Design an enzyme around this catalytic site. Sequence first.
Site, PDB file in Angstrom:
ATOM      1  N   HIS A 157      36.063  69.420  48.279  1.00 58.17           N
ATOM      2  CA  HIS A 157      37.236  68.454  48.147  1.00 58.17           C
ATOM      3  C   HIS A 157      38.274  69.078  47.013  1.00 58.17           C
ATOM      4  O   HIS A 157      39.687  68.872  47.372  1.00 58.17           O
ATOM      5  CB  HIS A 157      37.084  67.249  48.073  1.00 58.17           C
ATOM      6  N   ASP A 182      42.211  61.452  49.233  1.00 54.57           N
ATOM      7  CA  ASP A 182      41.165  61.828  49.913  1.00 54.57           C
ATOM      8  C   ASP A 182      40.800  60.616  50.868  1.00 54.57           C
ATOM      9  O   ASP A 182      41.037  59.489  50.721  1.00 54.57           O
ATOM     10  CB  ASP A 182      40.062  62.359  49.104  1.00 54.57           C
TER      11      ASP A 182
END
Lengths: 432, 428
Positions: A14, A113
């Site tokens: 990520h 996210d």
Amino acid sequence: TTTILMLPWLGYGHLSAFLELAKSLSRRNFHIYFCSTSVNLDAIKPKLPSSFSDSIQFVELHLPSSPEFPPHLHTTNGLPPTLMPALHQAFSMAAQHFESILQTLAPHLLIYDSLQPWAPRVASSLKIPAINFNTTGVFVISQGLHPIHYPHSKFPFSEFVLHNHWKASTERTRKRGEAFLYCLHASCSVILINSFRELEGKYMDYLSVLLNKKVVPVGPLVYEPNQEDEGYSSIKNWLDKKEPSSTVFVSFGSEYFPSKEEMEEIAHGLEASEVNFIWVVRFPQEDALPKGFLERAGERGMVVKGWAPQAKILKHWSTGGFVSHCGWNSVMESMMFGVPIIGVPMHVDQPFNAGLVEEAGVGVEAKRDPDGKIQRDEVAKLIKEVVVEKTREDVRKKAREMSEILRSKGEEKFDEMVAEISLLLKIEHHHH
Amino acid sequence: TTTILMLPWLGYGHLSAFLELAKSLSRRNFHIYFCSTSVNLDAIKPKLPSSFSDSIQFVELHLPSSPEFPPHLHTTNGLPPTLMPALHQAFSMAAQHFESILQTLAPHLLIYDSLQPWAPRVASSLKIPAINFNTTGVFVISQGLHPIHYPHSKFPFSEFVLHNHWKATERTRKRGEAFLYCLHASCSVILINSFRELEGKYMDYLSVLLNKKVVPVGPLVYEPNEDEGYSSIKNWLDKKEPSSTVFVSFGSEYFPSKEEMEEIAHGLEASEVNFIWVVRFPQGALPKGFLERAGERGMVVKGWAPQAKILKHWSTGGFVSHCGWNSVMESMMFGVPIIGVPMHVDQPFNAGLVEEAGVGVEAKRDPDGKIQRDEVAKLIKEVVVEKTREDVRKKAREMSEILRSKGEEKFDEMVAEISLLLKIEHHH
Ligand SMILES: O=c1ccn([C@@H]2O[C@H](COP(=O)(O)OP(=O)(O)O)[C@@H](O)[C@H]2O)c(=O)[nH]1
Ligand SMILES: O=c1ccn([C@@H]2O[C@H](COP(=O)(O)OP(=O)(O)O)[C@@H](O)[C@H]2O)c(=O)[nH]1
């Protein structure tokens, strides 16, 4: 002068995907506040050149700490699996610090996210537009949402079947609720996703319908390495000795520690193939290998401990295969560099990623037995066919064609994102 | 919003490179006034997507026109060589219209091609910063400027030797340009359409030769998405075996002589290679039985061809080219080995660059400076028909991999330099 705070989920894949997006936005004149825990920011800093020092500022998010859970452990990267509930709980308690950051920095936009319920919510209370960047693939999300609206009907556009092993709580409860999240704002009416139409275009169209949202592809976001050795010089000399397309890279990611049983099957399949291999083996922040396996392998095999220059190894001409857990970034990297994937998925989205690789024809998946176990014979056969004997020239041809498509992409990749962000800002400015 | 007016030279290759730079600039939030003659603006407009309609505006430059020299001829693309005097003269007379454009638009910056001396002078009069964008290679310029300071000494980093044929008004102007002065930040730096992997040493030398910062922005290659014209060509290519076909083109500004054409044709026929040859005639040819003998192996396209698409086709294994810069950049980007047949101007230097890099070969002219059918046939058989020059094919793949690997960092240096010069010159 238009500022964007970006908040990846804690986790190296990520962090990497967000960083590549940050670089593109910085080049398009946005000022980026790249927010993460100190350990993650430190891990990703080598990939940010000094050229970005003015435009991308690293901003620390503080998680609650203790002497046995110090900030070095504030990441999933190499985290002992048992400490994971603490990480989510500590991250759960970081909202007040996040609010302080937002109140001070006052960014015009938040890109967040998909593992932080509080993040858009904190942004909302401060009247800050927020948009979701999904660092992983489209296929998994559409498969998740399709049963909601069609409990009995067949999933369109794919013949993929999930193995019973994967088919078989607090996070699951959270995910299901997130399927029904509402939207009354421009910022929440579009999502950024790290994929591309040649691989997932049909799924992107279907996902938009399922979500009633604009789906903007901004990918693939592949980090391209430069000329510190994280062991490459030693590895490059070893790789140089090998024949072209004779070696497999073996990695199971930054967050998963294969079982003693699982690694036994992987090692035996590797030994039976007689392939060259570079295997990165990790331990929570040999004794996990079959006895004599590394001796029997000899110089055919090299084990790298902790971390390896994955992108550099995949680009080497001696590499002809990628035995991978099929985490999205690894899948994207393998496709960009034209290395066929021999999939050994472990959990989460990885089985879906392996199926996607299989239908695309760029790679193959090692099937588990009905009891959910890795099979050494399947591992050995696929490496023999794909790499050693090269009797799967169709897969190699598809992988090269896919690489050429991905290499052909230019700066247009980000145009749709830029247009959507500008609309986002203008609309939410009026309604504050 | 910062506004840039871009003024390419009137050649199609210069238009193409300028347009690619304009797209890069547009994505970095600069408003672009793209200025040229109507015929040129219409010629490149299909390569500009509709999404750029807001950010890139086509601004018409008017050259003097007459019934027999109408605007459709105000370009070097397909121009009869006997009209180049008129084209250059009309271009000189357009200086007054350029001033009217600049006065009205008042761009923050002017990016001008290296072929229009009035453009930086008009810019200086209106207090508009102007920076030179060189669409072609570094090698030719350093080769031009080395004897000035080092007579009696050979060029430092190359084993290239120019053939006598090429050693045998515009030159007078070009020679003076070598001594032009710089007293401003805008003139202290130049953008060039090259990359260090091919010309890094020459760029460093050129920086010393000019006392100027040389900023590489290349290679600037148009990646394609007639439109139906490819449809016939693609079907023919699809029947061919992989890497079995050579594309043959000599560019938009040169028409090979009948003798030159016959040597090329006989070289192709003897080689037995598959070939796509673009044959064109001036706005407003082959041996008698050439096409009949070639049959399915040979196809001729008249006027214009989709060069980039043909070059990316897997059936294409060679590019017989006049070695114009953009064609060379395209061949390297797409991994097609060049079989060089340079004609004039900077093309001999580009062909020498290709050979030394190892991505392609140069067909040598005979002592009297003539094309040789035997040399053409030999190279195509060595490189394409019978792949015995595997070193060349390997080097071409490596170079394409280098070029394809490059990302958005390619423009970082340019953007910083533009930011600096605008802030500096604003104060004055
Ligand atoms: O030894 C390693 C292991 C991983 N990676 C990088 O770490 C990222 C892993 O992200 P991915 O989505 O593939 O899997 P995850 O770790 O999230 O499960 C990728 O960019 C890999 O190239 C690396 O550089 N070296
Ligand atoms: O039939 C043709 C001939 C040329 N070109 C394009 O025109 C440009 C040629 O520019 P170059 O600098 O190579 O040569 P010049 O015409 O300036 O001499 C390149 O983009 C070629 O791809 C094309 O598309 N079709």
